[PDB]
Amino acid sequence: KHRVTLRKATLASLMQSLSGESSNRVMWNDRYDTLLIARDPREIKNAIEKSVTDFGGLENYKELTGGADPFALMTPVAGLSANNIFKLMTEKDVPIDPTSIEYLENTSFAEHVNTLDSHKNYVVIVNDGRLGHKFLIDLPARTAYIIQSDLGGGALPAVRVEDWISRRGSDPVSLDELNQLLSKDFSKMPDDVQTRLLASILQIDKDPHKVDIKKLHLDGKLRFASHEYDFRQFQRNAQYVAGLG
Amino acid sequence: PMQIFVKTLTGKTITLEVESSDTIDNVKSKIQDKEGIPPDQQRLIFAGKQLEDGRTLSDYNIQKESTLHLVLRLRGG
């Protein structure tokens, strides 16, 4: 119960560094075939400069993207956060490409977790076709945490990763409730059951009224994959990102 | 027949082989396969405007060799 203090201090350190231009662009970059720690800020900035120049300059670019300045300090949508925190957590010395990971489809979350060694840390990347979402489930060496952000177009309201970590990042989540939600039967459940499950696991203030199930894809596909990780490794990767200044 | 380009705010490019009759959904779903982002989490832009599901490329007058942007961030801060 002393590592959870470290886990929080690491996540807090990481989220705060993200006010840094360098830390912001390296954390949330989208090159997956490379080690996250191999990411060079200056290089990443030249490639944006390249893009902008190629399109006729900043004003003209901001016209195309509909107002979005590629240099701004960003906050990631669910996919980009999930993919990137995934790398940051699992990588040591070999690039892991969340794009090309094989997912389990014909396996319950409940029966999958039972195969997992309890003396190891796991991170579950969840690609949820019912919510149109993608988030992470941290499984320290059972205890479970959610790492997510959300654009807000779905049943869940928009949430910035920094705010999610800060309010819900070190708040464990019911193992069994995750089993209910990460079930193919979830689509069949009573409206209020769905609503409270979503509220309890994925809403920042655990509030059923902030959830709108009408926006669910009842036929969407649930898919997930897990991966073990060294806590030391994740710490160190975090330190790299947080130390860019 | 047709070719389009999808670019992120990072300058990352992918090329998609597409038909004018293809849906935005179809496109978003092919982006999910390469960039690992749920269609619902994407901000797909063409000529300044957000592309909505249930329309086609022709509905937005996207033509050969066009570029779409993939804005992967929440609005504002």
Swiss-Prot record, chain A:
It catalyses: L-glutaminyl-[protein] + H2O = L-glutamyl-[protein] + NH4(+). Signal peptide: none annotated. It comes from the Bacteria. The active site is at residues 78, 133, 148. Changing residue 99 to A: Impaired ability to mediate deamidation of host NEDD8, leading to decreased ability to inhibit the host cell cycle. It is found in: Secreted; Host nucleus. Its EC number is 3.5.1.44. One of its GO terms (molecular function) is toxin activity. Keywords: Host nucleus, Hydrolase, Secreted, Toxin, Virulence. One of its GO terms (biological process) is symbiont-mediated suppression of host NF-kappaB cascade. Coiled coil: none annotated. Its main location: secreted. GO terms for cellular component: extracellular region; host cell nucleus. Belongs to the Cif family. Protein-glutamine deamidase effector that inhibits the host cell cycle and other key cellular processes such as the actin network and programmed-cell death. Acts by mediating the side chain deamidation of 'Gln-40' of host NEDD8, converting it to glutamate, thereby abolishing the activity of cullin-RING-based E3 ubiquitin-protein ligase complexes (CRL complexes). Inactivation of CRL complexes prevents ubiquitination and subsequent degradation of the cyclin-dependent kinase inhibitors CDKN1A/p21 and CDKN1B/p27, leading to G1 and G2 cell cycle arrests in host cells. This is Protein-glutamine deamidase Cif.
From Swiss-Prot, chain B:
Coiled coil: none annotated. Residues 2-77 form the Ubiquitin-like domain. The chain holds residues 1 to 76 of 381 of the full protein. There is a cross-link at residues 7, 12, 28, 30, 34, 49, 64 (Glycyl lysine isopeptide (Lys-Gly) (interchain with G-Cter in ubiquitin)). There is a cross-link at residue 77 (Glycyl lysine isopeptide (Gly-Lys) (interchain with K-? in acceptor proteins)). This is Ubiquitin. Transmembrane segments: none annotated. The gene is UBI4. It comes from the Eukaryota.
